[PDB]
Symmetry: C3
Subunit: 599 residues, 3 copies
Amino acid sequence: PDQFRAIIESPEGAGHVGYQYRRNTGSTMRMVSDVLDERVSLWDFHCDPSGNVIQPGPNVDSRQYLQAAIDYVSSNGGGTITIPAGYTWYLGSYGVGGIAGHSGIIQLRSNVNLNIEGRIHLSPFFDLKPFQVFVGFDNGDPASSGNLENCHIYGHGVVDFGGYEFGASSQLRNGVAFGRSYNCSVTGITFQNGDVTWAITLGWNGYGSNCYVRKCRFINLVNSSVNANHSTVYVNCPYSGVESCYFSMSSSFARNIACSVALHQHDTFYRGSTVNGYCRGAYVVMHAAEAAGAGSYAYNMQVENNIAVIYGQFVILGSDVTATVSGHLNDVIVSGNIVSIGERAAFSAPFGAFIDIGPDNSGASNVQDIQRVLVTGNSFYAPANITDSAAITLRANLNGCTFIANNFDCRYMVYNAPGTTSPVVQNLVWDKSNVIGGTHANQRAGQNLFDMQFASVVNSTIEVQLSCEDLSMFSCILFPASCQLSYSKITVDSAWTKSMSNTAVFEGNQQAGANVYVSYPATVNLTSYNTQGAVPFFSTDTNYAWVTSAYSLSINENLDFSPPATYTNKANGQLVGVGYNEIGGVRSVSVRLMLQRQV
Amino acid sequence: PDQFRAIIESPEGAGHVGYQYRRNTGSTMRMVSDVLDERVSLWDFHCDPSGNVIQPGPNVDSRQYLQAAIDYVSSNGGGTITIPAGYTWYLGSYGVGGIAGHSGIIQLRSNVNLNIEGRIHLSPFFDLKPFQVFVGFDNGDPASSGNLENCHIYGHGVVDFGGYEFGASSQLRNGVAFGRSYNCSVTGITFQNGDVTWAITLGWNGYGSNCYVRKCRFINLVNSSVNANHSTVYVNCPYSGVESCYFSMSSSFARNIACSVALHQHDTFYRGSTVNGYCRGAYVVMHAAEAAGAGSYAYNMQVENNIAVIYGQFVILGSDVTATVSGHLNDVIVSGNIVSIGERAAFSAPFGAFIDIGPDNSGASNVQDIQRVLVTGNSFYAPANITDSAAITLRANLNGCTFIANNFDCRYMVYNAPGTTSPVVQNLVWDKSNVIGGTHANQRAGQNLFDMQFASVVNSTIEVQLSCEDLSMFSCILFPASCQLSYSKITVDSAWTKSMSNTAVFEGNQQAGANVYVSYPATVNLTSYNTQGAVPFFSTDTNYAWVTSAYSLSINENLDFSPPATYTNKANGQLVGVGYNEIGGVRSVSVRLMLQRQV
Amino acid sequence: PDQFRAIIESPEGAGHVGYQYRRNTGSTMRMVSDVLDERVSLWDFHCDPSGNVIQPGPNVDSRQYLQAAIDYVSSNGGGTITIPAGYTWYLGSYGVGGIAGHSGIIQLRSNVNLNIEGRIHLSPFFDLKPFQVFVGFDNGDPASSGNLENCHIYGHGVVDFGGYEFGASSQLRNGVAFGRSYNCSVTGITFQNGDVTWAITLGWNGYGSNCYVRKCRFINLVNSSVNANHSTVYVNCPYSGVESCYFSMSSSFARNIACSVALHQHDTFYRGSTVNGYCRGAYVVMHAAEAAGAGSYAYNMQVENNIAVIYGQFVILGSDVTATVSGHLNDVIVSGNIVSIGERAAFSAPFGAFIDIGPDNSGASNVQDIQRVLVTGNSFYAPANITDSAAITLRANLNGCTFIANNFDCRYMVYNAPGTTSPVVQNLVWDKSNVIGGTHANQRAGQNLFDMQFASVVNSTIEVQLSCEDLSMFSCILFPASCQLSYSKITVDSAWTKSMSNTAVFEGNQQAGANVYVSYPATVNLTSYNTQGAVPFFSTDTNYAWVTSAYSLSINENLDFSPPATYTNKANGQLVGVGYNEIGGVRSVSVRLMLQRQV
Ligand code: NA
Ligand code: NA
Ligand code: NA
Ligand code: NA
Ligand code: NA
Ligand code: NA
């Protein structure tokens, strides 16, 4: 029984000490080691070859120990490994095997969860180098990778990227690359103090399902001019999403390169999150080059109930093609978001927009197939000095987008730069229930509120309603002569428009088209015949051959006569109405009319 | 001290080994067994009568062991039992006592939580039989059952129903029947691989409170033609709800029988979820037969921010009565949802709808009391071939429903089949801010976009606004002669309507009613008197005794004369206006007019 | 080796029993005590000075033991202390040191989380006294307090305030005072059975960040007439919020004093929650006295997707000033909420409102700077008897608020009491897409639906659209003569208005202003000249010098003549139009017209 003492102090000691839960006679007779075996931590693998525990710290590379933990638990069919609180665990080398191709540090495995309670930091070994901290691929070539299933990272802990800048723009950096990922998630974790490309990526070219980021924080993850691009969470598998997250950047470079979320496959969502200091809110794009796993269509895309202060564009819609695949984007909803462009000089960052219809990465504007988008019940505000702010910058072909019950307070409502791209536009619908704010009133000299710089516009509705005066603007809406316009409805409500010289402008007289339905205010000079009694008044100009009716928006300050209340036209392009001369005499008046065509 | 060795290897050994937390002198001097007693797992009860641990597996019935665990922890005032990861735990027999009446396997108890990390599977013993895996009732008769309080099921684990079909349609199958359930929840769990009636039910005929399903997954839970009906989560207690869940079906039968969520009591919600492959999204119904615990009214019902691909109806509203109780439904909000009918043949599944006002289970349409419903900021799409798709199928009495700022792209906006039910309709409001999509343009031969096949319509608003042409439709809106119409506003905007032969149709000339307020386009033939100068034009037809004013929607291609810009009527039903003959002569013209009555 | 037995039974025994995880030869050789040291509970500190464990209960004050636990774990860099299930832990004395100034019981520390699984109760020592159960300040003076970081309270447990009433109204009571709090949260916990001021407060006069309350329950937390005021969660730091919570009160006093949530700093939110029995839903206010930590502006404020039954006001907007600081409120969104005033007598609780623009605490109405607010896609209902119910009670200066696509069913749409405050109103926008319900129809004798009792109104839009008749109302909208009105648009749709004697009323003839744009129905008497043929009709009254056009809303029951379809005016204030006498004769008619000015 020296033997006994010896057994007890050995590593098998706890397997010799009996235990029965709460002294319950119906409970299993076990050994202490069995109960301790119900949980597992990094401390169970963070040892030297003699089995002595090693303390973590800035001069200890914890990577091989965490790997051994994950490998072992994997072997038993899964479990959760805790990364203990009250310690910082440094990683100091790359991983080996399948994740080496991805610059991987740690390889994730199916059914093995990590509960990160303490902090994981990157050591300076990784300064100026690429890295992907957690990698769910098992092969250098992702196309020959197996899947990562049922892997969850959660807890109150922290992944800190050590503040190192990128060494070259062509490098990639990631926190969690889940890979071909099914039922994987990240919950509760703070990712901070980096220059990276993404914090988390979900899926790989459409392969994956049911991947989620929830209640995480992403802080200061861009810090250098070297960083080519950033999207904090990249969602590349369907039935996946980001909710209730917090995203914050403080670097100037983030204002030009960083986006909070990229949704790239069907049935994906971005909800309930707060963003500050980023260039962009979310990309919603079907890339043909990423369509292998879930088809060529991004549909059922939701961006809802977010709060953002950004410097560029809130939501960016896109689709593109490759030699063998064509991407399509449809069935999108953007709702309940409250968004503002932060304080900045005009033109000092990418052009401010709530919605951008962007060209593809090669700058092409004639590849897109975006339709059935609903933008509703959102608020948007840009400070008065930011010339480059729009409800929508429509810079590439659009096959449909519907706006209802939004409140836009920025420089333009609809915009595209002239002499850039000439988008083909179908089914753009701007309902009268969109409220146009007044922050930019008096700033619009030389500018058109809806600046329709497109190749063509068809099956579209623009119902302009102002809610305060802005007599600085050139017009409420303007179509250049190069824009064709057909089968559309364009109206300008008269409220706050009485002193405007131009309300709607059709530089190619496009409002005359057979299936164009318009109404807008204009000032018209009329002259009557001399006849006492019922008497016609006629416009002095002959520009009104397209008008179906017109009615007065002016009071009559005369006693001895009245001009017609309503007008029709004549073949020569004059307006004509019947007024009344109590006393005879040729009359001459200037009257503000509502001009109507087919409405 | 042989005695000592003996004690140590006994089940009481760990109660003899001292422990003090982190060697802290101010900490409690305890024994190892005390610390191990702070947690509990199934392994502590999964033993034979000699106390030897039994390994789970396909030929071990784990049921009695889990029951013993729950019973014991219950006895101590609660706790959380872990079901360990890396194992599959099979259930192989029914439970006994109070849950036998409910085909129960395991009986839940108050304050005893289950942390399901591994997998629970059903053994073939249950093939072709009913079952309810977890049951919170303590009595065969639910009316004499006590309550289940503070019971939470959570973790990353799985409940797998083993793929067995129902044996007969009259059978029921459930995952979690919480019973008369207060402060109970299911979080994180995957329910899969079944033919069941429900995965989870919350409450019992209104008794319960604060029950929630969050972040769960429900996959492939209908698989046979035998299954009579399915609702994945049935919410039958108030102050309860489903959020951020995922629901997926792949069976053809699911497309005809399955609904994701049923909300059956007040202050219930269904939010932030994704649905694919189901017939229906949510039932929102006050059943009089289920009104004992929380009253006869379902109010404060929320369906928001969901994503769905379904084959039948997205939200189904209802209420019914019994001999002693009348159910009422009011104060409902349906918002922010993006929903589509999946690819399918017309008529191949239940009639496609965003909203359905359904008859009761016996098919009665004259019992319902549904009002104060708001449907707003939703998107809906059905593929062009699906004739059987509507924004709303109004098949039973309706006391109110309001639509604002939605985007509906399907075959019908408002529909009910003729010669079926004749609903009595009050307070149906279709605001002008609803955008009508164009996917079904050219498919509407013989059909009315708003097909008002009701007994009567009162206090209703239908403001039709098209956003593209569809000249295939018979009319935009049609009331048959059997539909009474009063104290209502019906308008058709002229945009895209110029070539339509019929815009609004009142087969019983209902637009003449004293408190009917209408406007719509029509083509009218007029003839003038020969008089030079101001001259009247009169309609050749006498169908316009109800018109209060009309105005031109046509240009005047003549020089020598103009027709009136505006018209009123005369007792004989002619229109009359004053135009102008520059030169005398009887004129005859066909003009497109906006007809107005009291607007 | 008596020595060995002795060591083993000592507190260091477990540090002598070897363990190696799952017998894995590559795992660390540790001792049992090392694995037990990975977790910590209250039981590790709940002992007498001899180290004997003390059982909790009503006659044990657990406070010093919990404090020792938190202090010790703090010393190691953090961790999570469990408060065990199956026990109730009573607190019975105040804490000492820095939290004594705040009436603190327990002092929270950074990185130390509490997992509350059992119940924490207050002992009667605290009856009639102030208390703040958990306090994150480390100093009596909060301005000299350090921060509380990374502190999370979570679990399925309960904080029960023991039902004690306040002893005096000047006392404060709190559950969790996080203090200057950064990355702190409360999840899953039930707070119940009290008379307190707040359950949880986040931040201190703007200092803090990333504080959240989620999935908590707050039940019956006001119970006496002594309680001065209550806000269940007070959010006083930015980037912070409340989601998916449940709030319930049953006391009469709660209906007059209690609010569920107070949002007091920028980038804060209140979402997805259910409220019942409270006076108020949420305060959204920038208090100048609380602007030290995060600036003078509350912006990015979100209240969305809540469900509420309240007795007073749902959302209350405010801002105020101090001698050195001016508070501002802007960029607010209120969306998707479904709210009702519970059953109560008129005037029996604070005035019912969806939105209230409230004066400051000293009652001043001329300090506020509230603008860029969007209220959209909400539902509101008050029972027909509650005279004191409004969509918005506008009781203090307003610099902007926009309403779109809401459904309001209550007594008033816009209200302020006369002869109280005279608010200055700018940029109030009431879009036509707001649906006005009919519950209060026939109850509005002597009342104006939009009762514009303000000093002035500018840059505002009120588009009234009824959806049923209410001939009991005095008018749809009324401006008293003391209200100036300019640069505004005020319209009343004619639907359901044909029998109204007054539609819009301008008691000071304000609709004549140069930049006022109006339209509304009126009945007008006209008389014609005797001339056969085209013939003028003139109004008998001369009140129409402001009218720019008018058109008929009446049918013509005559054969021998027709009145004009449209009218203009003359300098003397008569209307004039040209009709037609088939046969000559002076005509005299009463016609319902739409009067238009500049629209
Ligand atoms: Na759309
Ligand atoms: Na062109
Ligand atoms: Na309604
Ligand atoms: Na009928
Ligand atoms: Na606004
Ligand atoms: Na005044």
